[PDB]
Symmetry: D3
Subunit: 141 residues, 6 copies
């Protein structure tokens, strides 16, 4: 069973969604990011860029998603003491909401953050005891 | 910004298991198991999205190396208040595959959300109970 | 080149394409009992076909990107093979036959990929497996 | 739903040849030969699309492995009642390449269809004669 | 990092024409004119790649908006010292298409380079002659 | 017509360095250095795009083989009248990496342009000054 629902009938209205996500990182890792000492690059900016691209890639990643003419995409990342918080904002005038884009942007930005600081988060067994992406959800539609 | 040189590294067994969880309403869950979801077979569609995602990891994550995957499995099991996704990836390369397992899980969870969007939204078009709880690398 | 649709009107575009893949009876039997190793053939194939519809412009050089409003891939099991019928809809300046054809083709390819080991003969060849005839069976007139 | 483990498979020469056919009106084949098709060089464009599609196979087919393709060729011949496409793909890896050759051919045929849509449609905008027939993996 | 809001902008006929050029050895030009390059029909393959590239712009340029293109054309002219590429894109949207026309031209130039790689390399495996130059929006 | 067979080729170290340049107006360059560009951090965004681009080469260039890249780095330096992009790609495979390096550089430059469009345009919406000047392979390992 599979299908992309018919939205021909629905009306073209302003669509907005704000999604929030959090990735738990080690205190030393946060310091490295803050002082921009991560060899792979500027963590925050790289993740934002990855998050913005992801928003546009949503339909090819999510099967039943409609291709949508996005009008605005913003990914904000705030550094906290226990990790990083990602907030993505998406908007367009279409006949089907944009939460999936906002949710995809956030998810990828969080993944990208993880990829950027892998060597600092892994322990002597090459594992992640502390690293964890927790609570990705929709703030408001 | 850069993809670090792995030239001087040995080709070894690379394996990774990731687990993720999405909180859903009980009514939504019941419909998922009774396969009464309008958009289709939720768990299978999500496994597929997750497996495809494992392969798209390098185009989604900037500093990730394009790698030769040998095995990819995404398992999803229904629980009383949500679905649990477990992704497993394996390869023989000079750089691990946890990003692939992490991406496969995130997209599978994203797909589960998409497939039940209308059953989870309240009368304000808001999602007060839905959320992707905890994606983490179980073992590498 | 990608033909200019600038001065074309925004209208309802819909197309239905059907295709067929010849499979062994034992394969057909595996698909029904949900005993195919790589997974649920029908659903995986439908999912791939739906995604392929959106991928059309990326695969076919002169195709325009299109705001698809509806995409459905139906897969019916027959004793000698699987039948795929894809339906695409959109209100735009250019029809959607190509999207329906691509969706169906990729669905058929996916079914094949899923049951490859049951279709192969002792020499590793495919003397019975065959994608027979993809066709546009109908589409709104423009 | 999963990408089967090929970790312990042998690394050996993998080759696949696929043949496909698209039935077209003669007035169409006429324009193809004369290269009077508005959208462009039908044959070369379809071949290019086919080569590209060979590489996009794993992105399109869920359970396919990303493989290091070493050779891809799409041959298209003009016949009186249609065009025949033959795609060949080679590699030295631990899993076959029939899917790559099947996809290259499938997309090469679709591109041909796209290029001559205008000429194949009948008075009611239907495609009563156009058809993609028999895509198969060839022996030897 | 952000895709600027364009919801309040006017929908209008958007067009963009980009010109680009690649210097090649005269011996390479000859092989293209005669259709004697191993990899294939340089002009048609580069044009096909450029057209596809126009559609991929939003996927390659981070802050680019996904735009419903209505027309894409890639002209490639053979000159005595190289090949000139001219791409034209058109749409009716809330934001221009210069980036689509620019991307089409660049990828077509890159494809040309790829097609004739072996013919351009000198004895040290270098490309002292080959060069993509002056990609710009004209008019 | 096709992607030539590289089977008989040897698996060796492949590396290329490409240099590219985009001409920008002085006021645009000032905003870049002051981080006053509305779209974001021009340098990092362009670098990230160039690196991703390196990986998409086979998808963009028809006769390119898919390659297991081992190193991709994009350098971007601000100059008086424009930005200089230098991409370095490396692999150990049967096909060099000049195309990956050229593509990374090209996309990085396109990204710079996209980022400062608003500052380059004139009152007509044209770009009389903006120009991607000269993308080229400045060096690459010799292969036999």
């Amino acid at each position: 069973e599979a299908k992309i629902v018919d939205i021909s009938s629905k009306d073209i209205v302003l669509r907005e969604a704000v999604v929030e996500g959090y990735i738990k990182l080690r205190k030393e890792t946060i310091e490295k990011i803050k002082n921009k000492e991560v060899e792979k690059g500027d963590v925050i900016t790289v993740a934002k860029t990855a998050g913005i691209l992801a928003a546009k890639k949503t339909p090819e990643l999510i099967p039943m998603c409609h291709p949508i003419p996005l009008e605005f995409v913003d990914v904000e990342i705030k550094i906290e003491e226990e990790g990083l918080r990602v907030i993505s904002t998406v908007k367009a005038h279409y006949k089907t909401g944009v939460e999936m884009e906002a949710l995809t942007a956030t998810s990828v930005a969080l993944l990208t953050i993880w990829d950027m600081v892998k060597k600092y988060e892994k322990d002597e067994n090459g594992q992640y005891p502390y690293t964890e992406i927790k609570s990705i959800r929709v703030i408001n539609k």
